[PDB]
Amino acid sequence: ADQKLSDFHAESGGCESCHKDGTPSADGAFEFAQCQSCHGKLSEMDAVHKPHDGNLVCADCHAVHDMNVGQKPTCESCHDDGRTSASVLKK
Numbered sequence: 001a002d003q004k005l006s007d008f009h010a011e012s013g014g015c016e017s018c019h020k021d022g023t024p025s026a027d028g029a030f031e032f033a034q035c036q037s038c039h040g041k042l043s044e045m046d047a048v049h050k051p052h053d054g055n056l057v058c059a060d061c062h063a064v065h066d067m068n069v070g071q072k073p074t075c076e077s078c079h080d081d082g083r084t085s086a087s088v089l090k091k
């Protein structure tokens, strides 16, 4: 049993949880503002998240309409050094 991350959110909050009047914005800014309003800012999150504050929006990693709940983003589309989440979060 699988659910897209967008549907997981919309089942509780509507499409409007992320989209003004349920309609996407051209630049993703309204959506990013909504993610941060609920979840906090990148700068307030863990070591995978913090360094992306000022360079990415959430959706650059969490493709909410194409990823299921539980799926973890990986790093290779922007980093060519083979890094992993664990290499930043495990000591």
Ligand code: HEC
Residues within 6 Å of the ligand: 005, 006, 007, 009, 010, 014, 015, 016, 017, 018, 019, 022, 024, 028, 031, 032, 059, 062, 063, 064, 065, 066
């Ligand atoms: C936040 C968790 C979201 C919810 C809930 C819904 N959508 Fe969304 N949508 C979201 C983002 C961050 C983006 C842009 C980046 C991306 O991943 O695509 C979108 C994009 C759309 C689009 C444009 C087409 C596309 O790029 O996929 C549409 C038409 C759209 N979203 C519609 C939509 C509907 C109808 C929703 C409720 C059922 C819905 N979205 C929920 C973020 C989120």
Ligand code: HEC
Residues within 6 Å of the ligand: 005, 009, 013, 017, 018, 031, 032, 034, 035, 036, 038, 039, 058, 059, 062, 064, 069, 070, 071
């Ligand atoms: C509030 C109205 C929210 C907005 C806007 C967005 N999210 Fe969210 N998210 C919300 C809740 C209440 C939860 C459940 C928390 C939990 O215990 O899981 C979530 C969950 C997620 C998750 C993880 C889901 C899981 O794997 O368990 C992700 C990755 C996530 N949210 C991302 C996300 C993004 C990218 C958003 C904007 C595009 C976003 N969320 C909006 C509440 C709300």
Ligand code: HEC
Residues within 6 Å of the ligand: 035, 036, 039, 040, 041, 042, 046, 048, 049, 052, 056, 057, 058, 059, 060, 061, 062, 072, 073, 074, 085, 089
């Ligand atoms: C890639 C560079 C990311 C960006 C930008 C954001 N997220 Fe993320 N997120 C990413 C990974 C690889 C993971 C799994 C490993 C980890 O560090 O936990 C996550 C995880 C989450 C979670 C779940 C946290 C948990 O349950 O332990 C949530 C709720 C989440 N991410 C939300 C979120 C939001 C709201 C973002 C923008 C503000 C965001 N993420 C950016 C990768 C990346």
Ligand code: HEC
Residues within 6 Å of the ligand: 047, 048, 051, 052, 055, 056, 060, 061, 073, 074, 075, 076, 077, 078, 079, 083, 084, 085, 088
């Ligand atoms: C693009 C969409 C990215 C994805 C996917 C991931 N990262 Fe990233 N990261 C990105 C940028 C634009 C930057 C700043 C410029 C640069 O590449 O240096 C970063 C930076 C980091 C850093 C700071 C250290 C450094 O690389 O200089 C860390 C620790 C980091 N990123 C970790 C990381 C991880 C673990 C990812 C996958 C889970 C990941 N990034 C994905 C853009 C993007």
Ligand SMILES: [Zn+2]
Residues within 6 Å of the ligand: none
């Ligand atoms: Zn959860």
Ligand SMILES: [Zn+2]
Residues within 6 Å of the ligand: none
């Ligand atoms: Zn770098």
Ligand SMILES: [Zn+2]
Residues within 6 Å of the ligand: 079, 080, 081
């Ligand atoms: Zn490199």
